[PDB]
Structure 1
Amino acid sequence: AKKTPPVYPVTVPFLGHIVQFGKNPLEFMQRCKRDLKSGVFTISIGGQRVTIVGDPHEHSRFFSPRNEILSPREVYTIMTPVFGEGVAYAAPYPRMREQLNFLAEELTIAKFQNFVPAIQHEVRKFMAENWKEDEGVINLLEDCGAMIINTACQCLFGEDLRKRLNARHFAQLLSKMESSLIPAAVFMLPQSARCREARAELQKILGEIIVAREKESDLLGGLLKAVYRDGTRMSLHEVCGMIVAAMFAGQHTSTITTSWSMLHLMHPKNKKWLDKLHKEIDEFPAQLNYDNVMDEMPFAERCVRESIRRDPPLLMVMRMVKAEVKVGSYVVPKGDIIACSPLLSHHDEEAFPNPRLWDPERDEKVDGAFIGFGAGVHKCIGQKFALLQVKTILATAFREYDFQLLRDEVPDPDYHTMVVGPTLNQCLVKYTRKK
């Protein structure tokens, strides 16, 4: 308006809206958009202006500008110690940029050939060490959280590295490094000591693994050959983070996505889809190749995307408005915190009629509406990988099994975590091994 978008009333001040927010952001965010007569709007959070972009037409405005205009570094100040000063968001954009490439060139579909089979294997194991019986009660959020970590390491970890680390141990270290995070952080330590310990431990372990490599093509090795613009290379420090960042990025996001996808599918209300998910994975063999998942599982791919569409794991993508930028009919003043929310966006009823309904064969009725993997200058570099894991798993686990939920309703998102997934205590599921 030659000026800033609409704002929202602060009943109890200098808290902002994190009071009514934290309980349910979706209930909340929807109130404001309807109430404020605008898909876009600003909110108070600790006195700090937060402008949420909730009109899907506008996503382009959010995801297109380069970091110098809209910086994401300021949001993730939280974890500079988790990856190391000068790694990821901690690094400078030119370097941060270069690092992104390194990881990217490690996850391209060029490296994905052994992956498919490497995946079928690691899951099939897990189940036999766990779903031993022909009827069992298992917590899916936890059983998935594990398989994802397993198969990912089976994919990006060298045989020698995986001998000196096992998923279990490595996960428990990521979960050591993580627990030093609390909800109100982006808007304002013996844990930094436990964070640095679990890290310095890993950082050392890795180096050793290197001593043995040289003296004699995985993610590690890949990052080793990595050369910066100026011919400089990564310090073990920088390296270490990168592997963590990679592993962290995919850990919760992927497992949750797998959990939800399974949760939807094992539902009776959702049988036809499961039935379609079979006419798909039926004539395949217990030996899956790249062609199989990639070019022949298209329906399955819809289910995973829908699940991410319905319950996005990252509710808010955020930037720092170093400079002004027009957004629809409004402007954004330097110093604002702008954000775009996949959770809000994926519920806009123009783009998604019955947003809470789970429809795999639905398509976005506003191009760009779906952002589960981001968009623009920052689209997910892990997207292709995550999908390959999840598709193969659902296929693996639905081929040799049938499922039922100890519930009537699929679980409810738990909004108390920085990375949202289905309510843990609801996930307990029970399997009937096929034969």
Structure 2
Amino acid sequence: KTSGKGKLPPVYPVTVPFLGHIVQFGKNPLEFMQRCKRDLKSGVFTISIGGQRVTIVGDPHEHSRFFSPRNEILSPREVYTIMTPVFGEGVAYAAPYPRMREQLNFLAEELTIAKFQNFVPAIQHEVRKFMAENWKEDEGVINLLEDCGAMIINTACQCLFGEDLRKRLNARHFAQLLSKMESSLIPALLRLPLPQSARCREARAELQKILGEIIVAREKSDLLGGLLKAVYRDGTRMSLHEVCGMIVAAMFAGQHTSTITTSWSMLHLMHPKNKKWLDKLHKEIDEFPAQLNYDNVMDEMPFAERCVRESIRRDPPLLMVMRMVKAEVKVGSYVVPKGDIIACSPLLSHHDEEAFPNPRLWDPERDEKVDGAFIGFGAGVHKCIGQKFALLQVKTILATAFREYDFQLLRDEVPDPDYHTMVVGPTLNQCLVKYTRKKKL
């Protein structure tokens, strides 16, 4: 059972039992969680979605307690059921953890620092190719958020998709399918049974078929190829279904998190308030040639990476990460019982006054004042596997972009975090920016 002296973290009083806190938690979770933490004199607290127990680890010191326990204790599968139609049955979380671990490990091996051999030139190539087309005028106005999403997807494909695949699967067209597979991840039913999404099913099968054809044609380097060579610890290869899933996951995971990190970063540096930091950025990328190489970005862009880190810290794209509690776990002084859902919020954590004084301030030179406080890319057993690539990708984009362009916000102050989904980026209708082409002669 327990048992039986299991303590329980303070519960926040709900005005409406049936409602839960959803009405508030949606409008602005930050203020809400920040309020609970303050009033309950405890960084670790439990709130209820309607008729449900949810314990939030909002104490930076306690991140270990959340990220270190293995799936057997804290299981993510139950929470992320929703994504199964997207990743597929028996893929990722949907599958048993012994297999899941393997699947991800294979994807990881494909995004390792080892594979970045030509990635940089590939990225830099696609970026310029986009700027030339969509930013013709010497001085014009565009939407940064929409444009970063395009650069990200195009860039990623140039890296992880082979010549044959790209021509067959148009880069933009892939985002078309990717977007349809999400038309079902806009919740919006939690108490009732799960319904299938026609949009998602079709778009995935449309992608799976295409991929299927390439494999046949390929049968008389890229992520897809890398995945084919894959063999399990029992002597089994990944099926088309499983391969398609991993790729979809890789692209889904990257698209939204990176396009937001890239947007936020450009937005800060862009603001006159952050002129100083823009100067030290140019100190860094001015002496670089027009053609960047792996070394330039990986080992010669330290400040640039700091900007990206701080942008992820201040406004983490991933609101919370959650897991189903199967067994008792110790958290600080308190404890969380079986059956509950334990969450951990980068957003709340990154705003702890002790760990990040003045958390709404964008300071690329700030440091964890509590070791481990930053969980932008997760931690422990579930560390992000696309981190290294995301950074290479984002840093390279920042360079090419600020190498031959100057940007100016049309708004007064940096955009507001647009909280709706678990994924949070800058407010779309505020990401309008005027670009002016740098002087040449």
TM-score over 0.5 for the pair: yes
Higher mean C-alpha displacement, 58-67 vs 412-421: 412-421
Matched position secondary structure for 1:319: strand
Quote the residue 1:203 is aligned against: 208
Question: 1:183–1:416: 8 Å Cα contact kept in structure 2?
Answer: no
Provide, for residues 389-430 of structure 1, a one-character-per-residue CA deviation record: whole Å limited to 9, x for no partner: 000000010000000000111001111123100000000100
On the 8 A contact 2:231/2:238 being kept in 1, the answer is yes
Q: Please give the secondary structure, in 2, of the residue aligned with 1:137.
A: strand
Which whole-Å CA distance do the structure 2 matches of 1:269 and 1:346 have between them? 22
The separation in 1 between residues aligned to 2:364 and 2:272, in whole angstroms, is: 15
Shift of 1:192: 1.4
Distance 2:282 2:66 in 1: 39
Q: Which moved more, 1:14-23 or 1:366-375?
A: 14-23
Secondary structure in 1 matching 2:48:
strand
**Per-residue Cα deviation, 1:169-222 (whole angstroms, up to 9, x for no partner):** 0001000111111234xxxx996122111111111111111111012x100000
Show structure 1 runs of 5+ residues with no match.
none
Q: Show CA shifts across 1:153-184 (max 9, x none).
A: 00000001001012100001000111111234
Match of 1:180 in 2: 184
Q: CA deviation at 1:4?
A: 1.1
What CA deviation, in whole Å up to 9, does each residue of 1:76-106 have, x standing for no partner? 1001111110011111101110001010000
CA contact (8 A) 2:92 2:100 kept: yes
Deviations 1:309-347 (A, max 9, x none): 000011101011000011000011001100000000000
- Whole-angstrom distance in 1 between the partners of 2:287 and 2:51: 59
Residues 1:115 and 2:119 are matched in the alignment: yes
Which moved further from structure 2: 12-21 or 70-79? Answer: 12-21
> Is this contact kept in 1: 2:320–2:422, CA < 8 A?
no
Q: What residue is the counterpart of 1:260 in the other structure? A: 264
Which region of structure 1 is more displaced relative to structure 2, 192-201 or 262-271? 192-201
Equivalent-residue separation in structure 1 for 2:380 and 2:428 (angstroms): 33
| Matched ranges for 1:47-196 at <5 A | 47-184=51-188, 192-196=197-201
| Cα distance in structure 1, aligned partners of 2:184 and 2:375 | 28
CA distance in 1, matches of 2:24, 2:237: 47
CA drift at 1:368: 0.4
Q: Offset of 1:267 from its aligned partner?
A: 0.5
C-alpha deviations, 1:94-152, integer Å up to 9, x for none? Answer: 11100010100000011001001111100000000011111111000000000000100
Aligned CA distance change for structure 1 residues 20 and 190 (closer, same or farther; 3 Å)? closer
Q: Secondary structure at the match of 1:429?
A: strand
1:239-272 superposed Cα distances (whole Å, 9 cap, x missing partner): 1111100100001000000000000011000001
Question: Within 2, Cα distance between the matches of 1:251 and 1:197?
Answer: 20
- The number of equivalent residue pairs is 429
Per-residue deviation, residues 25-73 of structure 1 (Å, max 9, x unmatched): 0011100000111000000101110000001000000000000100011
**Quick one: distance in 1 between partners of 2:87 and 2:331?**
33
Query: 2: distance between equivalents of 1:8 and 1:87?
Result: 36
Residues 1:357 and 2:357 are matched in the alignment: no
- Judged with a 3 Å threshold, the aligned counterparts in structure 2 of structure 1 residues 401 and 240 are, in CA distance, closer, same or farther, namely same
Contact in 2 for aligned 1:258/1:304 (Cα 8 Å): yes
Q: Which residues of structure 2 form unaligned runs of 5+?
A: 1-5, 189-193
Q: Check conservation: 1:51, 1:337, Cα contact below 8 A.
A: yes
Q: Secondary structure at the match of 1:223?
A: helix
- Retained in 1: the 8 A contact 2:157–2:171? yes
What is the TM-score normalised by the length of structure 2? 0.96
Q: Structure 2 CA distance, aligned partners of 1:191 and 1:139? A: 34
SS in 1 for 2:333: coil
SS of alignment partner, residue 339 of structure 1: strand
Q: Is the 8 A contact 2:271 2:409 kept in 1?
A: yes
> How far 1:10 moved relative to its partner?
1.3
Contact 1:183 1:418 in 2 (8 A): no
Partners of 1:192 and 1:229 in 2: how far apart? 34
Q: How many angstroms apart in 2 are the aligned matches of 1:17 and 1:36?
A: 16
Aligned residues of 2:102 and 2:232 also touching (Cα < 8 A): yes
Instruction: Report the Cα distance in structure 2 between the residues aligned to 1:93 and 1:347, rounded to whole angstroms.
Output: 32
2:426 matched residue in structure 1: 422
Q: Does structure 2 retain, via aligned residues, the 8 Å contact 1:84–1:241?
A: yes
Q: Distance in 2 between matches of 1:145 and 1:136?
A: 19
Moved more, 13-22 or 362-371: 13-22
Q: How does 1:18-29 map to 2 (within 5 A)?
A: 18-29=22-33
Residue aligned with 1:338, SS? strand
Residue 386 of structure 1 corresponds to 390
1:14 CA displacement: 2.6
Q: What secondary structure, in the 3-state scheme, does the structure 2 residue paired with 1:107 have?
A: coil
* 1:16 and 1:45 in contact (8 A); partners too: yes
Separation in 2 of the partners of 1:44 and 1:214? 54
